[PDB]
Structure formats: structure tokens, C-alpha cells
Amino acid sequence: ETNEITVGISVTTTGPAAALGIPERNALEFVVKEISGHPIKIIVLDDGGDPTAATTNARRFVTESKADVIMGSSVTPPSVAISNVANEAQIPHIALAPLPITPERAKWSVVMPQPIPIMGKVLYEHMKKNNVKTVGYIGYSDSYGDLWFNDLKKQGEAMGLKIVGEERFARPDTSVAGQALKLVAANPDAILVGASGTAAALPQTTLRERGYNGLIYQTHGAASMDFIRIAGKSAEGVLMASGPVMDPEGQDDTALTKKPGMALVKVYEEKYGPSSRSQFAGHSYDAFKVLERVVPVALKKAKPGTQEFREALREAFLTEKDIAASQGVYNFTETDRYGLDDRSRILLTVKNGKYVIVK
Ligand SMILES: O=C(O)C(=O)Cc1ccc(O)cc1
């Protein structure tokens, strides 16, 4: 009847990715604190973006906290680390960063952020519409950057785009001077930046300061105010993939995403200020929207704090259809662990220091 549901959350609230995990943690103020008469005990720990710390946190959630579900992390490397733990421990995991889904990961993990090909397709279509022919890339030297570069090669080239340079940088790097000078020399019509948070603004500002005049495209990893704050004037004209949480006011009342998105941005921005909404707050909030749907189904089969409950939650991801959330409408399957479609994305630009939808 009333025993607790335990949710362990590992997110990044210090280090280079704090811009993503802070909103994710903050959003927890606004999610339900009990479901179907069972109080939720949330245990939240910082991982610093570090896979080793995220592994530690997930392991202790399972063995010590007896968690029913684990969530996190804020960026791809720790999210991989948690999925690996979850799939060994046999515990549902809701990831808050895109990650590469492999056989080892697919059974127990689902993914809130939009998959990279959905977001790439919106960017590449705008490139084509706008007579862009040549494209350069600068992104992380890790799995997130690889996911993006592979997509640009596979989808972008399929659609006639020509890739004329690729540069990588590491997450903590404070300069991309050299990479930027190679891309400026190459002078593509557009450059795709495969990065997130504060690091996404680094190529933005560097490319402009080094004289780049083409179009710059940013991933959904960039979709918060921090980008505009840091990049300043250099952010003007940027094209950015984003989930729909960035603009619920603009959605049709028929959109399933409108009410949850309006509910989140209103309460979040009441607390944290005008335009404080972010992609990342959306993910955290939406993980609880998925839990509101799957928990009552699992409860019919088992009590919280048992392995049977973890199993029942896993099966419920597969049976509960059209989970409406701020970022999209979720339909998970055995092979699609993201579960999202075109209702899960919009295209933004920046005009006079504010995000504006691109139609
Ligand atoms: O930096 C990384 O590894 C990311 O995975 C960033 C990220 C987090 C959430 C998103 O919706 C999009 C991108």
C-alpha cells in the first residue's frame, strides 16, 4: 500500500557539465513526491561528469539503496557507465543524455533525450533549404562527438552535403584556437558543433573571433540560456536543434507535449527566473512523467523494493504507449530505447539575445 519507491539519480552538478545537471536536479522540485500512495524517496548524487564516479553511484544505488529505478547522467560518458551497471544489476535505468545503445545496454535502459539522427535530420534539412553545400565539423573527441560526426557523414552526405573538414577537442579544453583556424581556412558554408553546455559556446565564440562568416549549427546539447550568456553576440544567427520544451507557448493546444511543457516552464521559471527553461530540466521532469505512467502498471504485479518490481517496470516501458512529456511523446520498444518521433523536436535560432523558433 504505502511503502516507498526508491529512485537513485546520478547527475552532473560540478565540473564542465554542471550547466546540464544543475537544471536536471533543480527540476526535481517540481515532480511528484509520491505515486499511487507510495512515497518516492529520491537519492541524488553528483558524479562530476566522471564515468568512474557515475559507476560508483549506480552500484551503490542498487546494492545499498535498494533502488527501484536509476536515472542519469547529464552527459554521455557517465550515462554509458550507468547503463552498463543497470544492465548487469537488472534495474530500470532512465538516461538523461543520449548514448549509444548496444546489446549490453538495450534491455534495462531507456533514453529521454532525442536520438541524434532525429536532431541531425532537422539541421541538415535547414542546410539544404538554405543552399548550404559544404559543411565542417568540430566536436568532442568522445562518443557524443562521434555519434554526431557519424550522423553528419551518413545522413548529411546521403542528402548531398559535402564534409570538408573535421576537428575534435576534449571536454575540459579551454582553447580550440587551432581547430578553428583549420576550419576557417577550409571555409565551409556551414559548421556543425558537436558539443554541449559551456563547451558548445567555445567553438561559437572562437569561430566568429577568427573571422568565420558562415552558418553555425549547434546540437541539442547547447539548448539552455548558458549558451547565450557565454557566447553573447557570437550566438546571433545560430541554428540549434532543441526539444519542444523550449517553446510550449507556440505549440498548438492539440499537441500532447503542450500541457506538460507549459506546466514545467511555468513552475521552473517562477522559481529560477524568466527564460530559465532548458532542454535538461525537461529531461528530468519527463523521467518522472514516464514513472507516473509505468509505476501504477508495475504495482499491479509487485511491491516496490523487490526484483519483481524492477522487472514489472521494465515490461511496462514496453506496454505503456504515448507517454506525453514536455520533450516529446514516448513509445519504447525492445529495439527503440529512445521512443521518440518528429513531435520531439524544433529548430531554434538566436535573435537579439533571445531564442526564436525557426519555421
Ligand atoms: O555532452 C554530452 O555528452 C551530451 O550527451 C549532451 C546532451 C545531453 C542531453 C541532450 O538532450 C543532448 C545532449
Q: 261 near 242, Cβ under 8 Å?
A: no
118-252+342-359: CATH topology is Rossmann fold (3.40.50)
Q: Determine the distance separating the centroid of ligand 1 and the alpha carbon of 42, expressed in angstroms.
A: 23
Q: Determine the distance separating the centroid of ligand 1 and the alpha carbon of 196, expressed in angstroms.
A: 6
The fourth-level CATH superfamily of domain 1-117+253-341 is Response regulator (3.40.50.2300)
Estimate the crossing angle of helix 18-26 against helix 197-209, to 10 degrees. 140
Q: Quick check: CB of 6 below 6 Å from ligand 1?
A: no
Q: Quick check: CB of 98 below 6 Å from ligand 1?
A: yes
Number of H helices, E strands in the chain: 12, 15
Ligand 1 pocket test: pick from 47, 83, 118, 144 the residue with the most ligand atoms within 8 Å of its Cβ.
Answer: 144
Please, which residues bridge with residue 34 across strands?
A: 39
Fold agreement (1-117+253-341, 118-252+342-359): yes
Going by C-beta distance under 8 Å and a sequence separation of 6 or more, which residues neighbour residue 132?
A: 161, 189, 190, 215
For 50, other C-beta atoms within 10 Å of its C-beta total 20
Q: Name the residue among 261, 244, 279 with its Cα closest to residue 357.
A: 244
Residue for cell digits 551497471? 85
Q: Quick check: CB of 75 below 6 Å from ligand 1?
A: yes
**Structure determined by:** X-ray
Q: Quick check: CB of 97 below 6 Å from ligand 1?
A: yes
Q: Determine the distance separating the centroid of ligand 1 and the alpha carbon of 98, expressed in angstroms.
A: 6
Distance, in Å, from the CA atom of 204 to the CA atom of 198, rounded to the nearest integer, reads: 10
Which ligand 1 atom minimizes the distance to the CA of 76?
3
Q: Quick check: CB of 220 below 6 Å from ligand 1?
A: yes
Please state whether beta strands 93-95 and 69-72 pair in parallel, antiparallel, or not at all (unpaired): parallel
Q: This structure's resolution (angstroms)?
A: 1.5
b/e string for 270-291 if b means 16 or more Cβ within 10 A?
A: eebeeebbbbbbbbbbbbbbbb
The H-assigned helical ranges of the chain are 18-26, 51-63, 76-89, 116-129, 143-151, 157-158, 177-186, 197-209, 225-231, 258-272, 279-299, 307-319
Q: Quick check: CB of 92 below 6 Å from ligand 1?
A: no
Query: What are the Cα distances from residue 214, in Å, to 158, 159, 162, 223, 226?
Result: 22, 20, 15, 20, 23
Domains of the chain, residue spans: 1-117+253-341, 118-252+342-359
Which ligand 1 atom minimizes the distance to the CA of 17?
1
Which ligand 1 atom minimizes the distance to the CA of 77?
3
Distance, in Å, from the CA atom of 39 to the CA atom of 23, rounded to the nearest integer, reads: 23
Helix or strand run (H / E) with residue 354? strand 354-357
Distance, in Å, from the CA atom of 128 to the CA atom of 125, rounded to the nearest integer, reads: 5
Distance, in Å, from the CA atom of 292 to the CA atom of 311, rounded to the nearest integer, reads: 16
- Nearest residue (by CA) to ligand 1, atom 7, is 221
Q: What is the DSSP string of 234-262?
A: GGTT-EEEE-GGG-STTS-TT-TTHHHHH
